[PDB]
């Protein structure tokens, strides 16, 4: 069993918790406490290898955490999450990317850009815009819905596959 340490980052309210819960429980939770920050395990076979994913679902601002600090430092890959109907969350991605570059002292860090809430109509962030951002970072862009499960496995398993290239 191979362990992969994943960290889910992004603005409050974009569906970080919902994404993680969908992966773990196969259910959509719409009222997950915005302040609960914790790590979760998922045993799953990815491309023939039995993996134990260790996933930190980050939560909170202008306050420190021993667990989050540890995961930022030792995390092997990052899901950088915005919502396709939250323009500010997309614009925030730059600062999450800069934080990750600083924590790792590198511009070459396993990362996937995730545009969540893709089940809702009238997106305010175009696929093209997100693809452009991911291209500028040299990373994949994957759209997801924690509600319908669209893209959820894709996003997490792609991140594992990105780590394996490192
Ligand atoms: N329709 C829809 N709602 C979502 C999706 N993901 C999250 N939500 C809702 O968006 C809100 C914020 O989700 P949450 O997981 O708490 O975001 P977090 O602050 O990033 O952890 C909640 O009301 C969720 O029900 C999605 O893919 N589709
Ligand atoms: Mg949350």
Curated annotation (Swiss-Prot):
What catalytic activity does the UniProt entry give for this protein?
A: GTP + H2O = GDP + phosphate + H(+)
Q: What class of enzyme is it?
A: hydrolase
EC number of the protein: 3.6.5.2
Outcome recorded upon mutating residue 37 to G: No effect on interaction with PLCE1
Biological processes annotated in GO: adipose tissue development; animal organ morphogenesis; cell surface receptor signaling pathway; cellular response to gamma radiation; cellular senescence; chemotaxis; defense response to protozoan; endocytosis
Listed binding positions for GTP are 13-18, 29-35, 59-60, 116-119, 145-147
Q: Which residues carry this modification: N-acetylthreonine?
A: 2
What does the record say mutating residue 83 to T does?
GTP-binding activity reduced by factor of 30
* Result for mutant: residue 59 to T: Loss of GTPase activity and creation of an autophosphorylation site
Q: Which SUPFAM superfamilies match?
A: P-loop containing nucleoside triphosphate hydrolases (SSF52540)
Could you identify this protein by its name? GTPase HRas
Report the outcome of residue 38 to N.
Answer: No effect on interaction with PLCE1
What residues bear S-nitrosocysteine in this entry? 118
PTM section of the record: Palmitoylated by the ZDHHC9-GOLGA7 complex. A continuous cycle of de- and re-palmitoylation regulates rapid exchange between plasma membrane and Golgi.
Query: Result of mutating residue 13 to R?
Result: In SFM; somatic mutation; shows constitutive activation of the MAPK and PI3K-AKT signaling pathways
| This protein's UniProt keywords | Acetylation, Cell membrane, Cytoplasm, Disease variant, Glycoprotein, Golgi apparatus, GTP-binding, Hydrolase, Isopeptide bond, Lipoprotein, Membrane, Methylation, Nucleotide-binding, Nucleus, Palmitate, Prenylation, Proto-oncogene, S-nitrosylation, Ubl conjugation
Stored Gene3D superfamilies:
P-loop containing nucleotide triphosphate hydrolases
State what inhibits or activates this protein: Alternates between an inactive form bound to GDP and an active form bound to GTP. Activated by a guanine nucleotide-exchange factor (GEF) and inactivated by a GTPase-activating protein (GAP).
Q: How does it assemble?
A: In its GTP-bound form interacts with PLCE1. Interacts with TBC1D10C. Interacts with RGL3. Interacts with HSPD1. Found in a complex with at least BRAF, HRAS, MAP2K1, MAPK3 and RGS14. Interacts (active GTP-bound form) with RGS14 (via RBD 1 domain). Forms a signaling complex with RASGRP1 and DGKZ. Interacts with RASSF5. Interacts with PDE6D. Interacts with IKZF3. Interacts with RACK1. Interacts with PIK3CG; the interaction is required for membrane recruitment and beta-gamma G protein dimer-dependent activation of the PI3K gamma complex PIK3CG:PIK3R6. Interacts with RAPGEF2.
Q: Where is this motif: Effector region?
A: 32-40
Outcome of altering residue 144 to I?
GTP-binding activity reduced by factor of 25
Q: What is the effect of changing residue 61 to R?
A: Promotes interaction with SHOC2 and PP1C
Bilayer topology: Lipid-anchor
Residues modified as N-acetylmethionine are: 1
